[PDB]
Write an enzyme that holds these catalytic residues in place. Sequence first.
Site, PDB file in Angstrom:
ATOM      1  N   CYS A   1      -3.730  -5.425   7.840  1.00 48.91           N
ATOM      2  CA  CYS A   1      -3.484  -4.036   7.722  1.00 48.91           C
ATOM      3  C   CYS A   1      -4.483  -3.067   8.198  1.00 48.91           C
ATOM      4  CB  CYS A   1      -2.896  -3.716   6.174  1.00 48.91           C
ATOM      5  SG  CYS A   1      -2.862  -2.113   5.807  1.00 48.91           S
TER       6      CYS A   1
ATOM      7  N   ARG B   1      -6.400  -0.117   5.621  1.00 47.31           N
ATOM      8  CA  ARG B   1      -6.699  -0.456   4.232  1.00 47.31           C
ATOM      9  C   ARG B   1      -7.797   0.626   3.640  1.00 47.31           C
ATOM     10  NH1 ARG B   1      -8.405  -6.598   5.010  1.00 47.31           N
ATOM     11  NH2 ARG B   1      -7.942  -6.028   6.992  1.00 47.31           N
TER      12      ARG B   1
ATOM     13  N   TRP C   1       2.356   5.464   5.106  1.00 44.60           N
ATOM     14  CA  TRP C   1       2.899   6.233   6.241  1.00 44.60           C
ATOM     15  C   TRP C   1       2.405   5.401   7.589  1.00 44.60           C
ATOM     16  CZ3 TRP C   1      -0.607   7.870   2.626  1.00 44.60           C
ATOM     17  CH2 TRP C   1      -2.116   8.000   3.056  1.00 44.60           C
TER      18      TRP C   1
ATOM     19  N   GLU D   1       2.970   2.477  16.142  1.00 45.98           N
ATOM     20  CA  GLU D   1       4.068   1.391  15.596  1.00 45.98           C
ATOM     21  C   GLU D   1       5.105   1.931  16.137  1.00 45.98           C
ATOM     22  OE1 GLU D   1       3.614  -0.001  11.275  1.00 45.98           O
ATOM     23  OE2 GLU D   1       2.231   1.861  11.084  1.00 45.98           O
TER      24      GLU D   1
HETATM   25  C1  HEM Z   1      -1.058   4.345   4.053  1.00 47.66           C
HETATM   26  C2  HEM Z   1      -1.271   3.823   5.222  1.00 47.66           C
HETATM   27  C3  HEM Z   1      -1.062   2.690   5.797  1.00 47.66           C
HETATM   28  C4  HEM Z   1      -1.188   2.420   7.370  1.00 47.66           C
HETATM   29  C5  HEM Z   1      -1.602   3.606   8.164  1.00 47.66           C
HETATM   30  C6  HEM Z   1      -0.828   1.210   7.445  1.00 47.66           C
HETATM   31  C7  HEM Z   1      -0.751   0.594   8.831  1.00 47.66           C
HETATM   32  C8  HEM Z   1      -0.407  -0.992   8.970  1.00 47.66           C
HETATM   33  C9  HEM Z   1      -0.127  -1.416  10.166  1.00 47.66           C
HETATM   34  C10 HEM Z   1      -0.431  -0.798  11.584  1.00 47.66           C
HETATM   35  C11 HEM Z   1       0.112  -2.644  10.029  1.00 47.66           C
HETATM   36  C12 HEM Z   1       0.613  -3.652  11.417  1.00 47.66           C
HETATM   37  C13 HEM Z   1       1.816  -3.904  11.253  1.00 47.66           C
HETATM   38  C14 HEM Z   1       2.448  -4.165  12.473  1.00 47.66           C
HETATM   39  O1  HEM Z   1       2.668  -3.190  13.078  1.00 47.66           O
HETATM   40  O2  HEM Z   1       2.906  -5.199  12.911  1.00 47.66           O
HETATM   41  C15 HEM Z   1       0.102  -3.068   8.823  1.00 47.66           C
HETATM   42  C16 HEM Z   1       0.323  -4.209   8.126  1.00 47.66           C
HETATM   43  C17 HEM Z   1       0.496  -4.675   6.584  1.00 47.66           C
HETATM   44  N1  HEM Z   1       0.564  -3.432   5.785  1.00 47.66           N
HETATM   45 FE1  HEM Z   1      -0.498  -1.689   6.201  1.00 47.66          FE
HETATM   46  N2  HEM Z   1      -0.301   0.541   6.233  1.00 47.66           N
HETATM   47  C18 HEM Z   1      -0.591   1.474   5.366  1.00 47.66           C
HETATM   48  C19 HEM Z   1      -0.185   1.020   3.975  1.00 47.66           C
HETATM   49  C20 HEM Z   1       0.030   0.009   3.360  1.00 47.66           C
HETATM   50  C21 HEM Z   1       0.531  -0.297   1.998  1.00 47.66           C
HETATM   51  C22 HEM Z   1       0.495   1.044   0.886  1.00 47.66           C
HETATM   52  C23 HEM Z   1       0.580  -1.543   1.798  1.00 47.66           C
HETATM   53  C24 HEM Z   1       0.717  -2.346   0.563  1.00 47.66           C
HETATM   54  C25 HEM Z   1       0.361  -2.095  -0.599  1.00 47.66           C
HETATM   55  C26 HEM Z   1       0.092  -2.390   3.178  1.00 47.66           C
HETATM   56  C27 HEM Z   1       0.215  -3.637   3.194  1.00 47.66           C
HETATM   57  C28 HEM Z   1       0.532  -4.290   4.500  1.00 47.66           C
HETATM   58  C29 HEM Z   1       0.848  -5.569   4.914  1.00 47.66           C
HETATM   59  C30 HEM Z   1       1.193  -6.885   3.825  1.00 47.66           C
HETATM   60  C31 HEM Z   1       0.926  -5.662   6.206  1.00 47.66           C
HETATM   61  C32 HEM Z   1       1.228  -7.072   6.783  1.00 47.66           C
HETATM   62  C33 HEM Z   1       2.711  -6.718   7.330  1.00 47.66           C
HETATM   63  C34 HEM Z   1       2.849  -7.969   8.160  1.00 47.66           C
HETATM   64  O3  HEM Z   1       2.137  -8.899   8.799  1.00 47.66           O
HETATM   65  O4  HEM Z   1       4.029  -8.541   8.182  1.00 47.66           O
HETATM   66  N3  HEM Z   1      -0.091  -1.316   4.070  1.00 47.66           N
HETATM   67  N4  HEM Z   1      -0.297  -1.736   8.202  1.00 47.66           N
HETATM   68  C1  OUG Z   2       2.943  -0.579   4.575  1.00 46.63           C
HETATM   69  C2  OUG Z   2       3.277  -0.439   6.162  1.00 46.63           C
HETATM   70  C3  OUG Z   2       2.579   0.810   6.795  1.00 46.63           C
HETATM   71  C4  OUG Z   2       2.763   1.040   8.347  1.00 46.63           C
HETATM   72  N1  OUG Z   2       2.359   1.942   8.785  1.00 46.63           N
HETATM   73  N2  OUG Z   2       3.144  -0.323   8.914  1.00 46.63           N
HETATM   74  C5  OUG Z   2       3.605  -1.514   8.200  1.00 46.63           C
HETATM   75  C6  OUG Z   2       4.116  -2.383   8.925  1.00 46.63           C
HETATM   76  C7  OUG Z   2       4.544  -3.645   8.442  1.00 46.63           C
HETATM   77  C8  OUG Z   2       5.115  -4.587   9.017  1.00 46.63           C
HETATM   78  C9  OUG Z   2       5.678  -5.884   8.504  1.00 46.63           C
HETATM   79  C10 OUG Z   2       6.251  -7.066   9.380  1.00 46.63           C
HETATM   80  C11 OUG Z   2       6.341  -6.786  10.905  1.00 46.63           C
HETATM   81  C12 OUG Z   2       5.827  -5.704  11.464  1.00 46.63           C
HETATM   82  C13 OUG Z   2       5.733  -5.535  12.890  1.00 46.63           C
HETATM   83  N3  OUG Z   2       5.483  -6.639  13.754  1.00 46.63           N
HETATM   84  C14 OUG Z   2       5.176  -4.766  10.917  1.00 46.63           C
HETATM   85  C15 OUG Z   2       4.464  -3.702   7.022  1.00 46.63           C
HETATM   86  C16 OUG Z   2       3.959  -2.661   6.265  1.00 46.63           C
HETATM   87  C17 OUG Z   2       3.597  -1.513   6.977  1.00 46.63           C
END
Ligand code: HEM
Ligand code: OUG
Lengths: 403, 404
Positions: B108, B111, B280, B285
Amino acid sequence: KFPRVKNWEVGSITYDTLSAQAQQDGPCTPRRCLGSLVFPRAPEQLLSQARDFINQYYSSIKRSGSQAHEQRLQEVEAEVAATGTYQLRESELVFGAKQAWRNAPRCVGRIQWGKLQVFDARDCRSAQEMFTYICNHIKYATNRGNLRSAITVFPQRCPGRGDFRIWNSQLVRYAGYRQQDGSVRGDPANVEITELCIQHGWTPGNGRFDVLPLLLQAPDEPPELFLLPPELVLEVPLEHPTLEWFAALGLRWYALPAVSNMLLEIGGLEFPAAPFSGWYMSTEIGTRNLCDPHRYNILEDVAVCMDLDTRTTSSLWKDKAAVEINVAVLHSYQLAKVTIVDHHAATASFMKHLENEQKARGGCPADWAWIVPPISGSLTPVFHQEMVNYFLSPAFRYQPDPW
Amino acid sequence: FPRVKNWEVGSITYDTLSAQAQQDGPCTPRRCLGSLVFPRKLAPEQLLSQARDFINQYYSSIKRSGSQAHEQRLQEVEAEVAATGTYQLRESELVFGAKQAWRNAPRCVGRIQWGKLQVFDARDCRSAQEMFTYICNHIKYATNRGNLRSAITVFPQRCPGRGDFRIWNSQLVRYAGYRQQDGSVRGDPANVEITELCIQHGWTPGNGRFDVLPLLLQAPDEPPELFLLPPELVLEVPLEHPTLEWFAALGLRWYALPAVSNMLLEIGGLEFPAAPFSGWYMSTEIGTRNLCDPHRYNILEDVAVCMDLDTRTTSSLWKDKAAVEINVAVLHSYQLAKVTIVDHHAATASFMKHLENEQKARGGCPADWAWIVPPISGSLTPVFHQEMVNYFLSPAFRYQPDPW
Ligand code: HEM
Ligand SMILES: Cc1cc(N)nc2cc(-c3cccc(CN)c3)ccc12
Ligand code: HEM
Ligand SMILES: Cc1cc(N)nc2cc(-c3cccc(CN)c3)ccc12
Ligand SMILES: C[C@H](O)[C@H](O)[C@H]1CNc2nc(N)[nH]c(=O)c2N1
Ligand SMILES: C[C@H](O)[C@H](O)[C@H]1CNc2nc(N)[nH]c(=O)c2N1
Ligand SMILES: [Gd]
Ligand SMILES: [Gd]
Ligand SMILES: [Zn+2]
């Protein structure tokens, strides 16, 4: 027991059985992955590597187990017992250089691995003869713009003699002159080598694209300065197909990417001097060499000329200027009739390589973070290909700077 | 202690936090598997030891380790597992664990925000209809008329003897994907399987490219139940370009709330198979992966044709020019609708700051370079030149097998 590997675009699944043969250990452990680090890092150990190489050679020509295979193994065993070392046959050296390229995990151009011109320079005996070998290399590989892959292999490391070394990281590089402000005029990646060329008698210039001389080191001698004949260094002035002010930037790059500071390892033998060269993928020039903030760093200037709103990141001016800089690179090389490949064509051919290598050996060492281009990564097919990274021999290896 | 270098600045740090990595990842000295999306994965003494480590984490994080309150919570948990086989988290422990799991998420890039998370405690949920109520409240709070707010809702922990709560959808908001007669797909190809599950369990399908799917919610030891999201609850953004007037006519849209619903939350030995969370979007994405991936909406050539780009040769970089304009359209359309969105430049710069902050708070930060670096313009963002160390800390979000 074998890593299952998925392509997410197509949905397909293979197993990399080749990685089980990985001969040296990398930086990762079950507790933490270090795959993004740039530099992670007798008689019976030499013999088992030599035996494995000889086995590789005889399999390549489908003569495994023949009399010639057995006899060559015995021949090497006897030479190592008598001298502590051995010499490669000419054909083994050609095969070994190609195998090292084929095994290089960070190279996206390996579809070409079988078409490599090997120059045998193992009887070189002076820094001056070194220079002659290098000039013939640059001549052959440049080929008036029609680039041909090549490697020149100088004598192997041996006990009681210094190594041959090429002090330059590439055969053609632009000087980077350290300023008093802490700034640089020219290429910043080349500040140290520029300072070393000056210390060793080079009268510097004061341009941004001044071609550095060669610092060549023959065994047990200080390095010697040789100037490249200007008619040997092919260069492309950069212009843009529809942005006519671009040419006034006064940008240029050289035709030939020729890495000269890695070590080639074949069957336990080490070759500290073995320059090799292919042709450029445009994103190395456009995105990395010209847009990296610590390189020429022209991105903000191009955007301002394009009249982009550089005051907010949300305009994506950086992405827009970078795209157009890559367009100009490609346009200028094609216009100058100098081989170049764009990152879409390069990554497409690499996917073809992966499929060939899967049938041929059951796998292919690939470093995902270096195979994916530095712009537009998910637009190319390698982005969605899972990859397994590991070290096979023969191999190209990083080595300390001789100074 | 791994040495980690930033090649743009030249700075060096040491990741001393990786030493404390709980479980084991996929890589070995023989070969690196850091690019695989899923590692091939998917006793009271086991539970207590994980519970012990987390309680110590918590009390250390509030400067009360070894205190009276610390030693009492320890003995409280011991007794609860001896009597129940499991134990219950205090509401504050649940808040702390949820935020930590986000903080420890290696993939993520968002963070920097980890401290600001709204935890909704749904551990008293009984039926799937009640699940649907908790979910709809999450969605309204998280959306907040477009001023997006981070949030997670935690449903009851798995326990032995009963089936888990599960949200069958991979996200709360997902467009349908309709298998077509000529082999192709109308809609989102990623959702072909869930779209047919919804149809199987009763849902009458639409025929558009952006039909929002219903929710297939599964209470313990029950079949999943279909629920329809009220339309006024699902904020969507129609996509237009600031200067290409024909872009609006392509009919593209996306939704405001990225809310992942199929991951499992683990806190001190406890496992919540239903704990949907949302933040958000980062614009790439939407614009690069969801619309331009070959196995998603795959609109790149469509946009390139409208721009009159030369699609005959790869060296015109028409794929790159079209992609940049799609991301421009995404940013413009979200900002115009006043829906929270962040571009990949702003985001990666904030993650650099997070790296610095975590270096002082904890001595390092687990990060998966392949997922932190954006999928366009990678080396134009400062994370590209940042060496990273990936490892698994607990509390954590984990992938889990599908409920079917
Ligand atoms: C608030 C702004 C946030 C932004 C801008 C953001 C952005 C992202 C991005 C770009 C990814 C890469 C996922 C992808 O496209 O494959 C990701 C993954 C992830 N985020 Fe964040 N996220 C946010 C909030 C959160 C929140 C609130 C949580 C949980 C409390 C979180 C937990 C995770 C987890 C677990 C992943 C791993 C997803 C996966 O590998 O399946 N994120 N996030
Ligand atoms: C919380 C949050 C915010 C955000 N902006 N993006 C997210 C993307 C994922 C994600 C999970 C599994 C696979 C993929 C794509 N390979 C993306 C999970 C959480 C997210
Ligand atoms: C024929 C056209 C070729 C192309 C288009 C090509 C392309 C590339 C690219 C884009 C990289 C990544 C470098 C970076 O971004 O810094 C690379 C790395 C590399 N290439 Fe190739 N290459 C070609 C030929 C060759 C040849 C002829 C050899 C040797 C015989 C070779 C060996 C290597 C090695 C050893 C590396 C880096 C290995 C490391 O850093 O560990 N390549 N190449
Ligand atoms: C042969 C060949 C062709 C080509 N087109 N590019 C190349 C790039 C390198 C390279 C390797 C390590 C580090 C760096 C600088 N980051 C560049 C080596 C050989 C190459
Ligand atoms: C930190 C990061 O691994 C490093 O900057 C790498 C990333 N990937 C790369 N990939 C290529 N091809 N060339 C590079 O110089 C780099 N730099
Ligand atoms: C093979 C590779 O790990 C896979 O395609 C990853 C690469 N990086 C990614 N990064 C993000 N943010 N999202 C993804 O889906 C992926 N896919
Ligand atoms: Gd023009
Ligand atoms: Gd038109
Ligand atoms: Zn690894």
